[PDB]
Design a protein around this nucleic acid. Sequence first.
DNA 1: AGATTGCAGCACCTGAGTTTCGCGTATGGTCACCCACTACACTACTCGGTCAGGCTCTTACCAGCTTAACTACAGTTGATCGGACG
Length: 224
Amino acid sequence: DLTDPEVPSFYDQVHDSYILSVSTAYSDFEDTVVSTVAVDGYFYIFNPKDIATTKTTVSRFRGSNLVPVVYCPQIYSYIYSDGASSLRAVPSRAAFAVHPLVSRETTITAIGVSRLHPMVLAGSADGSLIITNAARRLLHGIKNSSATQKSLRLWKWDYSIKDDKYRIDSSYEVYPLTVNDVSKAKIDAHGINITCTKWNETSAGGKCYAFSNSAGLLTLEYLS
DNA sequence: AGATTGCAGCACCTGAGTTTCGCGTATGGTCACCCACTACACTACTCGGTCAGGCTCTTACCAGCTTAACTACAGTTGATCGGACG
């Protein structure tokens, strides 16, 4: 309680080890459920009214030391990296309904989403930044999912061990949804991994986004 | 409002990511056999000293003599010896 910070309202065990990310799935029609992932790999959704009577599991991942999880409030779905190399959506009231959104050759390290639109931004540690419409997956039929949903690479960082440049590539690439795909882990230059990515969420700024690599090359674009 | 057509819902054959598995190939581990080296106590044949046997050589003769030297009697002079000195 930010007004009474001396003692917590509750202190209950929910994971075996380090809890990496916690996220709130707010709604005008359902309880404020909370999701959590940890180095033990479990993804749990629960209601803070009573954890013990409500705790539910979405998945167990391989133990991974950075797992981005965010809430897409336009479609009431959590958006998460599987700790390896796929982006997936899970509705807060149907945990079994896991839909994979995109596959990448290197781990998804940062994810961003906004309160005004369903556009999800995901950055992989290969320096690739991808955009995809999560609502097109969530609000439509299962049958033609392998062809009706696609993604676009907005930018790619690259680096040369001998030339020492950072080499931002503006060229757009379309990646279709490989549903049955393998997890992958291609190692890449230390500075070119994407450390954060977020859209501005005001109406005036709503087409603007910001992203960063780990060397320091913060980058912003207005999508017009 | 019918002839032309799409959506998409049903069912069944199928495909890969993922898993469990069998074997190769090769490696450390069990343990059984029989070998090498060592050694305390022993086996046994020969060599060696001692003794007898008995065959063997070589001596030197009896008294006398007659060829050969000693072996006692015998006289002035040494120089250790006692026993006392320095």
